[PDB]
Amino acid sequence: NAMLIIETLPLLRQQIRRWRQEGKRIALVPTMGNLHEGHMTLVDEAKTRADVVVVTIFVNPLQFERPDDLAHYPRTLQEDCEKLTRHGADLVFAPAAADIYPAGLEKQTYVDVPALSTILEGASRPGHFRGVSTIVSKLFNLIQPDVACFGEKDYQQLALIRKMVADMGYDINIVGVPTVRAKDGLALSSRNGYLTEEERQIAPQLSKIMWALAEKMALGERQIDALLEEAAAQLLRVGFTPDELFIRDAETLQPLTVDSQQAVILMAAWLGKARLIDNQLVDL
Amino acid sequence: AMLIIETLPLLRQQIRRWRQEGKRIALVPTMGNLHEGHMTLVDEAKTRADVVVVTIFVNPLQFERPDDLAHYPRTLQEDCEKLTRHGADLVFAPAAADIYPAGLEKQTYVDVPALSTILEGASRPGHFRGVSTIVSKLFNLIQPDVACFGEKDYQQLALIRKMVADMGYDINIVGVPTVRAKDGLALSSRNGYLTEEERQIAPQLSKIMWALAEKMALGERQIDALLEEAAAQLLRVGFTPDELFIRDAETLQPLTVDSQQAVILMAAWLGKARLIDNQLVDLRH
Ligand SMILES: Nc1ncnc2c1ncn2[C@@H]1O[C@H](COP(=O)(O)O)[C@@H](O)[C@H]1O
Ligand SMILES: Nc1ncnc2c1ncn2[C@@H]1O[C@H](COP(=O)(O)O)[C@@H](O)[C@H]1O
Numbered sequence: 001n002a003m004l005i006i007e008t009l010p011l012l013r014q015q016i017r018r019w020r021q022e023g024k025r026i027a028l029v030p031t032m033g034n035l036h037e038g039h040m041t042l043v044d045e046a047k048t049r050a051d052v053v054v055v056t057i058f059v060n061p062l063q064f065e066r067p068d069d070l071a072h073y074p075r076t077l078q079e080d081c082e083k084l085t086r087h088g089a090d091l092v093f094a095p096a097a098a099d100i101y102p103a104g105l106e107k108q109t110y111v112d113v114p115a116l117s118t119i120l121e122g123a124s125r126p127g128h129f130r131g132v133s134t135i136v137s138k139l140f141n142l143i144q145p146d147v148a149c150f151g152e153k154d155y156q157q158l159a160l161i162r163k164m165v166a167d168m169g170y171d172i173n174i175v176g177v178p179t180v181r182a183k184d185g186l187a188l189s190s191r192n193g194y195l196t197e198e199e200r201q202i203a204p205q206l207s208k209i210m211w212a213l214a215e216k217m218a219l220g221e222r223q224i225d226a227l228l229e230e231a232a233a234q235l236l237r238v239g240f241t242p243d244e245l246f247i248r249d250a251e252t253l254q255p256l257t258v259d260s261q262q263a264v265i266l267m268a269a270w271l272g273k274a275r276l277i278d279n280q281l282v283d284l
Numbered sequence: 285a286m287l288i289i290e291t292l293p294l295l296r297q298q299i300r301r302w303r304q305e306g307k308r309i310a311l312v313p314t315m316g317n318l319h320e321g322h323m324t325l326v327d328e329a330k331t332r333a334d335v336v337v338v339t340i341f342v343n344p345l346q347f348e349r350p351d352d353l354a355h356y357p358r359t360l361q362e363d364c365e366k367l368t369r370h371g372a373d374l375v376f377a378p379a380a381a382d383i384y385p386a387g388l389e390k391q392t393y394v395d396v397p398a399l400s401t402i403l404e405g406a407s408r409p410g411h412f413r414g415v416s417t418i419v420s421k422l423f424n425l426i427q428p429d430v431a432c433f434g435e436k437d438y439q440q441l442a443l444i445r446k447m448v449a450d451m452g453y454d455i456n457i458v459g460v461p462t463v464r465a466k467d468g469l470a471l472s473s474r475n476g477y478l479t480e481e482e483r484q485i486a487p488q489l490s491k492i493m494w495a496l497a498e499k500m501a502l503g504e505r506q507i508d509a510l511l512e513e514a515a516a517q518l519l520r521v522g523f524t525p526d527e528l529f530i531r532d533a534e535t536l537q538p539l540t541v542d543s544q545q546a547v548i549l550m551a552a553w554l555g556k557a558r559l560i561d562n563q564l565v566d567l568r569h
C-alpha cells in the first residue's frame with residue numbers, strides 16, 4: 001500500500017493501535033531526516049524483521065547542546081520521503097517539536113542512562129545523550145515497536161540505547177546495522193559533503209588505518225595505548241588532525257578488562273570543515 | 285485461577301498471550317503487605333479491563349532511608365491469598381536482583397522534574413525518581429491499557445500523570461479514593477511501624493486535617509495560619525509534623541483567585557512511622 005505520512009500524535013496513535021490490534025510486528029527506524037543510503041540500509045534491515053516499518057523524522061531539540069544548531073539542521077522532508085517510499089517504509093512520522101515537547105525542554109520528563117551518557121562523546125556534550133535516551137524512549141512508547149534499527153556508525157548512541165532497553169524493560173530487539181561505505185571504504189555521512197575534492201581522496205585513509213589495527217588484535221595484539229599512539233601519527237602523516245582515539249569494551253565503552261568479550265575501536269579525525277569518524281568491532 | 289509470576293521472561297509470555305486473546309489489561313502497582321485500600325484498587329481495575337495485573341515489589345530506588353527499606357514489611361503469601369479473593373488475574377512479584385541486576389548505581393532512571401522536587405519531593409529527596417523509574421519499567425513490561433493508583437499518594441498520582449503525558453504512554457491513569465480504618469486512619473503498610481499506643485493517637489492526623497478543612501469550608505483562607513495551627517495540634521498530641529501544605533488541587537501550585545478546589549497535604553511522624561494524608565476542599569460557594 002501507499003506509504004503513510006503522519007505529522008500529528010492523534011493520527012499516529014490511531015494507526016499504531018490498529019496495527020497492534022491486528023498483531024502486526026512493528027519495526028522502528030529513528031532518524032533526524034536529511035537521509036542518505038546509510039539510512040536506507042536501516043530501513044532495508046527493518047523490513048526483513050517486521051511486518052510494518054515505521055521511520056521517524058524528527059530533529060530533536062533536547063539533544064542539541066547549542067539551541068542554534070537546530071536552526072541550521074537541514075529540513076528535506078519531500079526528498080526524505082521519496083527515498084523512503086522506494087525502500088518500502090510503511091509510515092513516516094514527522095512531528096513538530098511543539099507537539100513533542102509542548103511543556104518546553106527544561107521541565108520535560110527525561111530518561112538518563114548513567115555512565116554511558118557522560119563518558120567519551122558525552123564528556124564534551126553535557127545533556128546530549130539524555131536528549132537521545134529521552135526521545136528514543138518516547139518514540140518506543142508512542143510506536144510500540146518489536147524491533148528498532150540503529151547504525152553502528154554512532155556507536156555510543158547504539159550502546160546507550162541497548163543499555164536503556166535492558167534496564168527499562170523494553171521488549172524490543174535492538175538491531176545495530178553495519179556502516180554503509182563507499183567503494184573507497186569511507187563511511188557514508190551527511191558531513192562528507194563539506195570535504196573538498198582533494199580531501200575526499202584522503203578520507204579513505206581513516207578506515208584503512210583503523211582496519212590495520214583490527215587485524216593486529218585478531219592475531220592477539222593487546223598493548224592498547226601504543227596501538228593508538230601509532231594511529232594518531234599514521235594519520236598526522238597523511239593529512240588529518242586527529243581528535244583523541246579509543247579502544248574500549250563494546251558493551252560498556254569502559255576500558256577493556258579480562259572479562260571483555262568484544263572490543264570497539266573508536267576513531268575520530270579532522271579534515272578541513274568535517275570531523276570524520278569511524279569504528280570497528282573486534283571479537284575477543 | 286490467579287497466576288503468580290516472578291520472572292520477567294515468564295511475565296512477557298503471559299502478557300503476549302493475553303494480547304493474542306484480545307484482552308484489555310489493567311495494572312495496579314504495589315509494594316506488598318496489602319490491605320483493604322489495595323483491594324479497592326484491584327476491585328476498581330477489574331471494572332476497567334478484562335484482566336488485572338497486580339505488582340508486588342518493594343522498590344529500593346524509592347527508599348531514601350536505609351532503615352525504612354530494611355524493615356518494610358514483606359508478607360507475600362498473605363498478599364497473594366487476599367488477591368485471590370478479589371479476582372486479580374496475575375500477581376507479578378519479582379526479585380530486586382532481576383529488576384536491577386547490576387544494582388542501582390548504574391541503573392537507567394526516569395525523572396519528572398515538574399513535580400519530583402517540590403512538596404513531598406522536597407521532604408523526600410530521591411524518592412520520586414525511584415517511583416517514576418519503577419512505574420515506567422512496569423509500564424514497558426506490561427503495556428497496560430489502564431493503571432490504577434490511590435489518591436492517598438496524591439502527588440505521586442499527579443507525577444505519574446505528568447510522566448505519561450510527557451513520555452507518550454498510551455495508558456489511562458485512574459485515581460482511586462483513599463480507604464480508611466473505621467477510626468479514620470488512612471490505611472498504609474507503614475501503620476505497622478506504630479506501637480499499640482501510637483496506633484490510638486494516629487487517627488488524630490485525620491481529625492486535625494478535617495478540622496482544617498471545616499474552617500476552609502466556613503471561608504477561612506489564611507493558609508500559613510491554618511497550617512501553623514494544624515502543626516500545633518499535631519505537636520500537642522505527640523506527632524512531629526513535617527512540612528504541611530495547602531495547594532490548588534489540579535495544579536499543586538499555591539492557591540489563586542482562579543482556584544476552585546484545594547488539597548490539604550499532611551505529613552507527620554509518629555514514632556517510627558511517617559504518616560501522610562490529604563483532603564480535597566471545595567472552595568466554591
Ligand atoms: N553510513 C551509515 N551506515 C549505517 N547507518 C548509519 C550511517 N550513517 C548514519 N547511520 C545511522 O542513521 C541514524 C541517524 O544518523 P545521522 O544521519 O547521523 O542522524 C543513526 O541510527 C545512525 O547510526
Ligand atoms: N489507604 C489507601 N487507599 C487507597 N489507595 C491506597 C491506600 N494506601 C495505598 N494506596 C495505593 O496503593 C498503591 C500502592 O501503594 P503502596 O503499596 O503503599 O506503594 C498506590 O497507588 C497507593 O496510592
Ligand SMILES: [Cl-]
Binds near residue numbers: 346347
Ligand atoms: Cl516509599
